[PDB]
């Protein structure tokens, strides 16, 4: 899932080091296990992320803040491309709507104008972002083509949320176990606490996260507080289904974009999405008018100092 922009020392969501080589400036769009394998306490090279992403990275991977230059979303910042006071590059982070601290990167330099989207959930508001409202011509757009594959239909966030609420409605006497990742889908937990007028049980780390986002005070760690429990998706399995049903009638929900067969009758795999649908991408690209689109090619003129920055 990592991308290395050719003929530039730019690696977005890529931390293989040996496979990178020419990379010198590393960017992270959002905290998601898919795009962060290699980050650790030993990662000792510059890294740029969003505010909330800076907090989350430092906490949940123990990366030093020394190598984490956090930049505010929406503004344009200047980053070097060499060891001298010569060439630079402009980065603009835009709200991606994928998850907490999710951003898209807009790079401007000798390579032209590139727009990395990472994972992003298109909203119409996204088109009215000052950085893209100046009629600027993107020369290359790394687009989130996740839902472009017509292999299997996937409902939207709202459709899947409706299905979850109907499911829990049909089972008012049951405990509910929601399988999640380490990021995303906190708003859905808020909405469930609203509709069912209960308290959502969390892990201590998930509680700390929720308080990072400043959500409504509807969460708790006491297991007996509410009938809705939020747990790691790896906990939802047949063995644990029997384990929980040996205490109180329990029902598991697995919101996911994958193709997963339920290994239990009381496990409901709910096809989630968390990505932009095809028609949304159509409107998006038709408004952007990008020179070319690349799923997640012209050779630029690499300046003299940058070529030295790439080889060291
Ligand atoms: Ni993601």
Author numbering: 2 to 297, 314 to 329
Q: Would you copy out the relevant sentences from the publication that reported this structure?
A:
Human SNM1B (SNM1B, Apollo, or DCLRE1B) is a 5′-to-3′ exonuclease, which was first identified as one of three vertebrate orthologues of the yeast DNA repair nuclease, PSO2 (4). SNM1B is a member of the metallo-β-lactamase (MBL) structural superfamily, of which the β-CASP (CPSF, Artemis, SNM1, PSO2) nucleic acid processing nucleases are a subfamily. All MBL type enzymes possess a characteristic α/β/β/α MBL core fold that provides a scaffold that supports the active site, which coordinates the metal ions essential for catalysis. The SNM1B sequence comprises 532 amino acids, wherein the N-terminal region (amino acids 1–332) contains the catalytic (MBL and β-CASP) domains, and the C-terminal region the protein-protein interaction regions, including the well-characterised TRF2 binding domain (amino acids 498–509).
An SNM1B coding variant, H61Y, correlates with an increased risk of breast cancer. This substitution is in the MBL domain, being located adjacent to the active site. We solved a structure of H61Y SNM1B1–355 (3.2 Å resolution). The overall architecture of this is extremely similar to WT with a backbone root mean squared deviation (RMSD) of 0.3 Å (312 residues to 312 residues). The structure around the active site is also near identical. There is only minor perturbation of the Y61 neighbouring residues (R60, Q63, R206, R207 and E209), and no effect to the α-helix that Y61 resides in, or the adjacent helix, which contains many of the nearby residues. WT and H61Y SNM1B1–355 showed similar thermal denaturation profiles, suggesting that the H61Y variant does not substantially perturb its fold. The H61Y Michaelis-Menten kinetics, as measured by a real-time fluorescence-based nuclease activity were comparable to WT, as was its ability to bind ssDNA in the FP binding assay. Our study on the structure, and properties, of the breast cancer associated, H61Y variant of SNM1B1–355 reveal its fold is very similar to unliganded WT SNM1B1–355 and appears equivalent to WT SNM1B1–355 with regards to thermal stability, DNA binding, catalytic efficiency, and nuclease activity. Thus, it would seem likely that the reported deleterious associations of rs11552449 and cancer risk may be mediated by the effects of alternative transcript splicing, rather than the non-synonymous substitution in the protein-coding sequence.
